[PDB]
Amino acid sequence: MSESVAIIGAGLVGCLAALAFSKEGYNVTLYDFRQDPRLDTTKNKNLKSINLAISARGIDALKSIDPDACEHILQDMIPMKGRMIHDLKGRQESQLYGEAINSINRSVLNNSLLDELEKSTTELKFGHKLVKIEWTDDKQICHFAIGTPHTEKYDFVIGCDGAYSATRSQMQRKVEMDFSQEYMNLRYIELYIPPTEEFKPNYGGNFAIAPDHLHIWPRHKFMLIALANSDGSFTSTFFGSKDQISDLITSKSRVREFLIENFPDIINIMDLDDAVKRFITYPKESLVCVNCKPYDVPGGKAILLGDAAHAMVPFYGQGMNCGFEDVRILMALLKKHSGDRSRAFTEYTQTRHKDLVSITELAKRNYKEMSHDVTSKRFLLRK
Ligand SMILES: Cc1cc2nc3c(=O)[nH]c(=O)nc-3n(C[C@H](O)[C@H](O)[C@H](O)COP(=O)(O)OP(=O)(O)OC[C@H]3O[C@@H](n4cnc5c(N)ncnc54)[C@H](O)[C@@H]3O)c2cc1C
Numbered sequence: 001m002s003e004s005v006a007i008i009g010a011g012l013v014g015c016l017a018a019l020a021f022s023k024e025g026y027n028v029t030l031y032d033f034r035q036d037p038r039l040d041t042t043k044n045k046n047l048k049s050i051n052l053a054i055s056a057r058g059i060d061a062l063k064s065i066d067p068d069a070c071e072h073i074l075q076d077m078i079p080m081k082g083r084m085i086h087d088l089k090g091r092q093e094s095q096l097y098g099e100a101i102n103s104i105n106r107s108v109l110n111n112s113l114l115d116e117l118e119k120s121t122t123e124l125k126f127g128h129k130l131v132k133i134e135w136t137d138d139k140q141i142c143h144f145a146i147g148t149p150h151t152e153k154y155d156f157v158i159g160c161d162g163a164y165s166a167t168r169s170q171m172q173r174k175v176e177m178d179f180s181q182e183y184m185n186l187r188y189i190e191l192y193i194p195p196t197e198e199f200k201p202n203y204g205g206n207f208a209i210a211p212d213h214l215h216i217w218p219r220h221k222f223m224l225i226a227l228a229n230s231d232g233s234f235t236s237t238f239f240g241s242k243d244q245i246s247d248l249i250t251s252k253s254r255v256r257e258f259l260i261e262n263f264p265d266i267i268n269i270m271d272l273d274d275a276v277k278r279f280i281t282y283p284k285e286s287l288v289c290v291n292c293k294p295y296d297v298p299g300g301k302a303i304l305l306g307d308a309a310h311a312m313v314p315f316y317g318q319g320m321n322c323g324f325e326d327v328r329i330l331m332a333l334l335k336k337h338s339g340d341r342s343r344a345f346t347e348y349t350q351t352r353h354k355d356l357v358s359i360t361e362l363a364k365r366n367y368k369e370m371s372h373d374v375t376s377k378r379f380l381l382r383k
Contacts, residue, residue, distance in 0.1 A: 002025065034127075064328050073113070079212065081097065133167070192236060195207070195208075212228075292310065293349065316367040
């Protein structure tokens with residue numbers, strides 16, 4: 001009487017999808033080739049950033065799925081009041097909220113969703129790599145490499161397997177899928193702002209700068225940002241072109257001078273030497289933007305959510321929030337259609353792809369305002 005679903009990928013979107021479907025009564029199995037990130041034996045946590053901005057929409061998605069869990073899962077998130085813009089003179093200006101965001105730790109959020117899933121009948125299958133799918137009019141046969149071949153049949157499959165989705169490739173054999181991948185001329189580097197030694201009453205913690213603002217140092221086609229952690233430290237991120245970064249890291253002094261010149265007010269709050277070290281040593285992940293149409297295999301046999309459907313630019317886009325909204329939209333469509341996945345998945349493709357156009361255009365406009373159109377003397381250095 002129950003239907004079974006294989007969800008491929010146990011990142012943030014996959015875990016939320018698993019929560020949503022298990023709650024709605026489906027028999028869920030959640031696969032990931034990675035080891036369980038809650039284990040100390042698992043060395044690669046695959047965490048692209050230490051923390052995340054979760055929007056009202058992202059929060060509302062988790063809340064629509066499980067309000068009690070959502071309360072518990074998000075208890076330590078730090079609400080933001082606005083953005084704090086830092087100019088070349090180290091002047092800060094508060095711009096109060098667009099959409100509200102809250103800072104939350106990535107590891108904690110992903111680990112907490114897994115914890116919630118263990119309280120359901122969801123089967124967790126780490127160490128399982130999806131390698132092939134056979135599509136039929138009844139069940140879909142999913143082939144895995146474990147550790148070792150392994151196959152299991154499912155009524156339908158949800159690809160939440162990220163930007164390079166194996167599920168998406170498998171779908172492409174069954175349906176004509178328009179597809180594009182674009183490798184961004186953009187890299188990011190994670191930096192660190194330590195907690196202060198003493199509790200700062202006006203900040204409510206050991207914070208070196210305002211914890212209730214997303215801090216941005218916007219420059220011409222590059223940017224530094226910072227978002228608070230619960231312990232008083234900030235996760236800081238530098239974004240710049242591949243060419244700019246490659247040219248900088250040829251020399252430690254060159255990086256150091258660049259940082260001092262462009263972000264002079266970070267010397268008060270960050271160790272320059274290890275910043276330089278982090279800058280030269282941080283592994284540079286390639287950022288790819290991918291788009292998809294359709295998102296489903298006809299007859300309700302499969303659907304793609306999260307980065308697997310629409311991997312987008314960091315910061316300027318909001319991949320996790322978008323993926324959380326994917327899930328919320330899908331579940332509402334399933335309820336609207338009384339469990340008819342054929343109808344729901346088809347309508348999903350139509351409406352979500354209209355949404356994606358609007359989302360993409362917003363992100364481009366965000367990049368234009370915040371990073372491209374930056375030439376004033378307060379933001380672009382004159383030698
Ligand atoms: C630096 C940075 C900062 C960001 N900040 C924000 C932010 O502040 N707010 C926000 O909303 N978004 C943010 N994002 C975007 C966000 O990180 C991603 O959109 C989000 O994590 C995507 O989640 P996902 O579950 O779709 O994909 P993923 O996190 O990529 O998870 C996919 C999972 O599938 C597994 N997998 C892949 N292939 C297979 C296979 N063949 N078989 C089995 N398993 C497989 C992988 O191991 C992986 O665990 C940021 C991104 C970056 C890089």
